RNA sequence: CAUCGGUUCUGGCGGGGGGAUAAAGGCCCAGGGAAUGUGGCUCCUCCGGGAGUGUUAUAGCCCUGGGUGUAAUACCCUCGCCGGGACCGAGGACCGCGCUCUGCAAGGAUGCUGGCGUAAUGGUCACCAGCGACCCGUCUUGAAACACGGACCAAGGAGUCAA
């Protein structure tokens, strides 16, 4: 009798998708990147980037 | 994908919140809204939805 | 439930894999061309007159 | 001219619909006519375009000529 | 013409049996976004080589940021613009802090002074004047002078447009 | 077509009922020539005679199509390559589907249109990109 | 007024990802360079300041590489949270999908309270006000104009019957 929005009414969200509670609890929208020192930019890349 | 998309009824969006560009019936490259805007379609989807 | 968990994991892995391929190409001194898009969303924004 | 003390009849800028439509149609007919005379026009037209060149007030015009000459010698050596 | 960003766009012809490794072409293009940048790349490449969008690919699009946006610099822009007569050269100079800001000032100045649109202007070179002796336009030479200090006469005070009536006649000396 | 002698492999082509034929009228032979229309048209063989064949054409008149049966000598008919892309394909699907059913692994057996290309990596070494201006500098020379 | 559901406008906050793992920039380290040449020195002087010299001095700047640094921030994308407001309440025992499962925001609004109980709400007519609004038929042609009819009212008045 009434279409309810899953993005607003969380009960319909858990009806359509039971994994929503696990998503919100485990914070899968805030997953940090893998650790490790990032390699620097190669000099040829910057030279081509700033080449006239 | 064909069966899923044909099962999905065509989406009836509302008008964009914030409107269109000043001249809408013109290509997106020229400064309008028609044509392929590539990844910029998402802001239009949030405005129209 | 298990299927949605698998789908979320697959989306995250695809995103990080695209970023990783771009980064390793940049570090090896080349250019990674990403795949052309397979999905488009078409919106009709003009009327039905003339 | 004694315009300031005794002005004349004003020139109206308010155009009429008849005049607007007639001017638009004459403009379109003129465009079609010049396209026809352009297709029938026998005047010679160069395929190449005379390039304007490089401005004298560009301060690095000498370095650009150096670059062009160097690339020409490099292309001649490669060929 | 808007908030512009400079992009390097590198593209090439599609690899065939005759040419497994076709040549790469890189251009520096001022555009509001990457779609316009790629469109301008394909336009300028159609103007020079036997490559179009249907027979070529975009290898890379990268943003070229200014090395020193906090340093006041003099830029010389050599450009060609299309008018009723034809294509004409212009050399102009702008005292800005980035190449993109110089290009926006260029587009505004050509629109204001010669009625030239974005579609009719080709940016051929944007260079940095390393020395002040390379400055040629007197309106930049009066700005690069030694001990440049000037007043600002007749400064209209900024009064809020929603405050209609004031009880004091404003002064123009601050 | 060159003036003079007609090639003689025209007579050595065998036409059967149901074959698809083009109509390319030879100007040298006047016997068996069809109308000014029905030249450059593709049709179906329904009758095979000693020196001529019958071709089914669908002419248009007003707002309808009318079947026409045209008797054309072997001089002016040519085998049509419209259904060779069908016959070669259907044979190829026949043996490929037999082999795939014998092996076990299912395959995609329908022809597919041009899909967007996948991701790949392009090396810069020995293929360093060259910087281009809107106009060529040797041209500005 | 409180607690809700549907739609929607707007504000703030907490995270994540990307790019030159932003670019800058600060603080250090190692080089190089110049003037719109700082200090010093010299020459003029109205001695107020100018002129010449040279690379930091009794100011500083620019270029290149390295460290802090996986720095911050801008921009783009994204995961949530907390407010402020408007319009709406369709259905009428239960069933169903569900959840945080003694119950519930889960197949459409209930709970508490106040005043009044009458022209108070509501309605009709007359008039003012804001906005909108050419005189009806017919004819013409593709249409408009032109032309034609209309002072007003009551009654009568025009696709019927037979074969």
UniProtKB/TrEMBL annotation, chain A:
Sections of the chain in a coiled coil: none
Protein name as catalogued: 60S ribosomal protein L4-like protein
Bilayer-spanning residue ranges: none
Protein family according to the UniProt entry: Belongs to the universal ribosomal protein uL4 family.
Residues of the full protein shown: 314 to 365 of 365
Region ranges (Disordered): 31-52
Domain of life: Eukaryota
UniProtKB/TrEMBL annotation, chain C:
Coiled coil stretches, renumbered: none
Key word Ribonucleoprotein present: yes
Keyword terms: Metal-binding, Ribonucleoprotein, Ribosomal protein
GO annotation terms (biological process): maturation of LSU-rRNA from tricistronic rRNA transcript (SSU-rRNA, 5.8S rRNA, LSU-rRNA)
Keyword Ribosomal protein: yes
Top-level taxon in the UniProt lineage: Eukaryota
GO MF terms held by the record: RNA binding; structural constituent of ribosome
Gene Ontology cellular component terms for the protein in this record: cytosolic large ribosomal subunit
Entry similarity comment: Belongs to the universal ribosomal protein uL30 family.
Protein name: 60S ribosomal protein l7-like protein
Annotated organism of origin: Chaetomium thermophilum (strain DSM 1495 / CBS 144.50 / IMI 039719) (Thermochaetoides thermophila)
From TrEMBL, chain D:
Biased composition (Basic residues): 6-39
Region (Disordered): 1-57
Biased composition (Basic and acidic residues): 40-52
Location(s), subcellular: Nucleus
Protein name: Putative GTP binding protein
Native source species: Chaetomium thermophilum (strain DSM 1495 / CBS 144.50 / IMI 039719) (Thermochaetoides thermophila)
Organism placement in taxonomy: Eukaryota, Fungi, Dikarya, Ascomycota, Pezizomycotina
Residues represented out of the complete protein: 2 to 80 of 558
UniProtKB/TrEMBL annotation, chain F:
Pfam families named among the record's database cross-references: Ribosomal_L21e
Keywords: Ribonucleoprotein, Ribosomal protein
GO biological process, one term: translation
Record flagged with keyword Ribosomal protein: yes
Keyword Membrane applies: no
One GO term describing the cellular component: ribonucleoprotein complex
GO molecular function, one term: structural constituent of ribosome
Family: Belongs to the eukaryotic ribosomal protein eL21 family.
PANTHER family: 60S RIBOSOMAL PROTEIN L21
Protein name stated in the entry: 60S ribosomal protein l21-like protein
Organism: Chaetomium thermophilum (strain DSM 1495 / CBS 144.50 / IMI 039719)
